[PDB]
Design a protein around this ligand. Sequence first.
Ligand SMILES: O=C(N[C@H]1C[C@@H]1c1ccccc1)N1CCC(Oc2ccccc2)CC1
Ligand SMILES: O=C(N[C@H]1C[C@@H]1c1ccccc1)N1CCC(Oc2ccccc2)CC1
Lengths: 316, 316
Amino acid sequence: TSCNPSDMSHGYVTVKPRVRLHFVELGSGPAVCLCHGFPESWYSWRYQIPALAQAGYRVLAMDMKGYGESSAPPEIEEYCMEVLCKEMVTFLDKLGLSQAVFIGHDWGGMLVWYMALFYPERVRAVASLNTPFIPANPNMSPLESIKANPVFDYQLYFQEPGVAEAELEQNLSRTFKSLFRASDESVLSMHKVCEAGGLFVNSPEEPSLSRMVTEEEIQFYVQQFKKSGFRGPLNWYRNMERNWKWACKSLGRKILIPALMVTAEKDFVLVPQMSQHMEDWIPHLKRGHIEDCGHWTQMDKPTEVNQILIKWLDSD
Amino acid sequence: TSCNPSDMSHGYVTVKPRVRLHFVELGSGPAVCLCHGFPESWYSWRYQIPALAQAGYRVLAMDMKGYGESSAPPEIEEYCMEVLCKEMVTFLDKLGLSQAVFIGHDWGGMLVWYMALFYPERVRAVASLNTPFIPANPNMSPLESIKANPVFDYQLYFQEPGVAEAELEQNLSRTFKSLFRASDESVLSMHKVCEAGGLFVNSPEEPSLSRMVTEEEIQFYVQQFKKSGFRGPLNWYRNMERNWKWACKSLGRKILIPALMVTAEKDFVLVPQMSQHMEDWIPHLKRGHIEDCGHWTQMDKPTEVNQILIKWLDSD
Ligand SMILES: O=C(N[C@H]1C[C@@H]1c1ccccc1)N1CCC(Oc2ccccc2)CC1
Ligand SMILES: O=C(N[C@H]1C[C@@H]1c1ccccc1)N1CCC(Oc2ccccc2)CC1
């Protein structure tokens, strides 16, 4: 059911002089590109990779820019959606793939939605775990969306370069044990982070291991983030204005390729209802929904995830 | 139309603790594994890779064990056909490929024949450039064979470890310019190498640049062989008794999968006639033939090679 790092084919593509993307590859058949979120890894797809391969697909599980063995340049602008999207199109070009199915989770979900929006010729079909597609609003900028919804206080905390990095890097084992939990095992409150002076200001010093993950799996993430740290990954949050401006350019156009939106009942940041009017701009959208499932969808409910993705790939 | 290394996807698979195989990967569709000869590189397929990919195939171009970015262990036993084939099987396994079409040239061609013989379940179809399939003779030694063939003198010169390595490594640039030439530009004789005391004793000091290759292409080979040198590549020659014995436990089995033999009119080591009775053991055998084509079939007549491989791939 799971992947061992040293038993995988590891691929590397240079998308521009500074930058190479690492991926893991398994299977033959149509190309399916898996795109993880924050603060994760190709390995967050470890339960999907063999199941999709076995179901008849050629799986490319990325280390997204900023992560793992992929390049992690320091400049904030290197991680705006426009740049990240172009690099992924280049990725396909170097691999000689005219198209691929894109499946994303969290920030990776935002990525695949924009790939579908701006590069539909290169996206055979698109699926997102948790992250909805909301057309950009030309009237309200990104800063007025947080005042409307206090849940994203932590996002403000993530803005100033250096600050969140030092807390998250301070003790990597504690970071991942604190984050990677089932929703009922939560020890964090993304609500008054800036005032409290940190995400872990008063969560346990020695968190217990969640029933979702083993010590060995936590240590893999720990090992991976020692390479470049949290600057690249946190830079994904620091281009809200640039992402908004860019999203605003494709107002009129709609996603006409096969599409899947999967919601998780207990994800308290990417709430199911955020996706509810996606029919209005994607009438053919297919849906899944996972019960009793928190934010860490792939880890939390791998079997449900596998069943939903495999059924959708095999049909449309 | 060729390949630029920095524009290729580079793949890496650890097949056992000490050994990882490097490959370049381009395209989508049925998997086609390309296996070069001595002393070459994945790069020797530079004109086939884009053509096959464009023709609807997923091309995996190998650095064979001993070469380029693949591991090159020192021991001679690591390069016997049994170990090499087993490793190629592990390669497919970890990539999650149940089968591949195998296409080989020179020593690579000998490899794919053995793969077809001993691992028919993993080999979809097989094609060899220049290298014929001759069933092993139970009654005649490997050293006994060379005594009915004086052109294979150079093979004796290859047996003592360190000797040829030193000659071929002493000026890499001269080495490749001396070897990679059209058969009418030849500056070498493989008549009496042992007693003449070297492959390059009577060839020019600064050979001209063959018409088949540019200075830049030559320098790529130079760069590649600086990593490991010639020990690994030459160890391919130093297992004749073991290879013979291994092959002598396969004399009942025939190749039932689709098979392609491509002969090269001016290959003065792997002569076309050496293949002339192959349909006695493979009745369904397809053939290709290339006029005015020396040993370096891929670089010498890339158009014709492409035409032939694509036609046969689309048919069986
Ligand atoms: O912050 C996250 N993910 C949380 C789980 C990560 C986290 C949080 C806190 C600590 C560690 C990890 N977002 C919000 C930004 C974007 O969602 C959008 C953006 C715009 C529109 C719709 C959705 C991607 C997902
Ligand atoms: O030496 C080569 N290749 C020559 C062109 C390389 C060369 C030569 C000289 C210098 C550089 C490169 N082999 C020997 C092994 C096998 O030949 C056999 C053996 C047994 C049966 C059938 C075929 C394949 C061809």
